[PDB]
Symmetry: none
Subunit: 237 residues, 2 copies
């Protein structure tokens, strides 16, 4: 039996999601924090939605972790808060940031094959992205002073916008699509057959151990390459 | 970087049971046989002169000389390594490599290591007491005929391990993305620890144990009478017809 419920929540700036087919529609607004859930009775019974230490944790109750095996008809989450500095998602999850996003420091974390996407402008001073698994991150309108990407596995990071200093660490066949992202400086390490595409204005430092590749647009004045293997670091137009 | 001037060099080598290679575009053809150790390099001359092939404490190390470590700057037109020895307990490759074991392989304990990109395949029977496989980066392991008591597969990055044969206890650790195709490998016990994304297929006779932090799928055939799991995220163990 599918039903919609409004869950009371105190102010939170972190969001931890461990779901099964969970679809999260989050927005940042000036209004009071809100949380609405649409799912089966089984999920309401076995899942918890508690806020502690200013972190809204949506995960199965501890006494229903041994069993699991949910597979619900629907699991849509509508949430909103004044601020958001950390986003952690694990398992089958889809996180949609449907509004403009702003924070001094932000950490996006994905473990598994989920998806995190900033549909609108995302503005920060420091943005950290960590992906472990075959998941995806998409942000066509990201603007930050520093961006650190830590990737392990066959995942993708699609970026667009502008970034001052961008560091990427790729372990495996992860892919970074960022030709539409103007980076002042790029520094990266690829261990494997991973692939990076970027627009670099001033400086690029790239290192590849394996057959991966780094392709950069723009005209950096300082270029440092290091390749052990068949990989390549090239300028494209 | 290779000048296209391909040369074929037979390198004198003493007894060795460990083979460690470093480079790019390398094709390694190894065989185990009851004959004197041998080594043959076929590659561009200019690259050849930048490489060393020394045996140190039964470790045959194929890599660039110290004074040329400023980068695998060179890019070979070809680089094939043909080698043979009476025994082999370890084979490690770093960079971009294709390692072919072209004969039956036998050892009490064996370690197959792959860093960077490439593939390691045991084309014929491979028998051990304990087999260890370590893949870091984007590497694959293929061995349709592996027979051992204990197998340990440790994967970091984006990796695949194809297995066939018979194993007593199989242990796999995946960090990042990991895939195991082992329906043709009859395992008494399956143990896996996944951190990221993992997809495991195997024939299990007695037991399955799986810990999943992220996303994971464990598909099995057979009728194991002991199945347990811990999951943080999404994980599922299921039998397939």
């Amino acid at each position: 039996n599918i039903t919609t419920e409004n869950i009371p929540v105190s102010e939170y700036d972190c969001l931890e999601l461990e779901g099964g087919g969970m679809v999260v529609n989050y927005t940042q607004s000036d209004a009071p924090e809100g949380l609405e859930i649409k799912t089966d009775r089984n999920i309401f019974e076995k899942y918890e939605f508690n806020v502690e230490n200013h972190k809204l944790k949506i995960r199965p109750k501890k006494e229903f972790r041994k069993h699991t095996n949910f597979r619900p008809t629907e699991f849509m989450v509508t949430a909103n808060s004044r601020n958001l500095k950390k986003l952690a998602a694990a398992g089958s999850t889809h996180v949609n940031i449907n509004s403009p996003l702003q924070a001094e420091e932000f950490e996006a974390g994905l473990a598994g094959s989920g998806i995190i996407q900033f549909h609108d402008t995302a503005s920060f001073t420091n943005l950290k992205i960590e992906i472990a698994g075959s998941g995806d991150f998409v942000g066509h309108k990201v603007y930050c002073e520093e961006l650190n990407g830590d990737m392990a596995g066959s995942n993708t990071i699609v970026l667009g916008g502008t970034v001052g200093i961008a560091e990427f660490s790729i372990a495996g066949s992860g892919t970074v699509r960022a030709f539409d992202c103007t980076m002042d400086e790029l520094e990266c390490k690829i261990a494997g057959s991973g692939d990076i595409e970027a627009f670099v204005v001033n400086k690029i430092k790239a290192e590849i151990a394996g057959s991966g590749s780094v392709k950069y647009k723009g005209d950096p004045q300082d270029i440092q390459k290091k390749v052990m293997g068949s990989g390549k670091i090239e300028k494209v137009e």
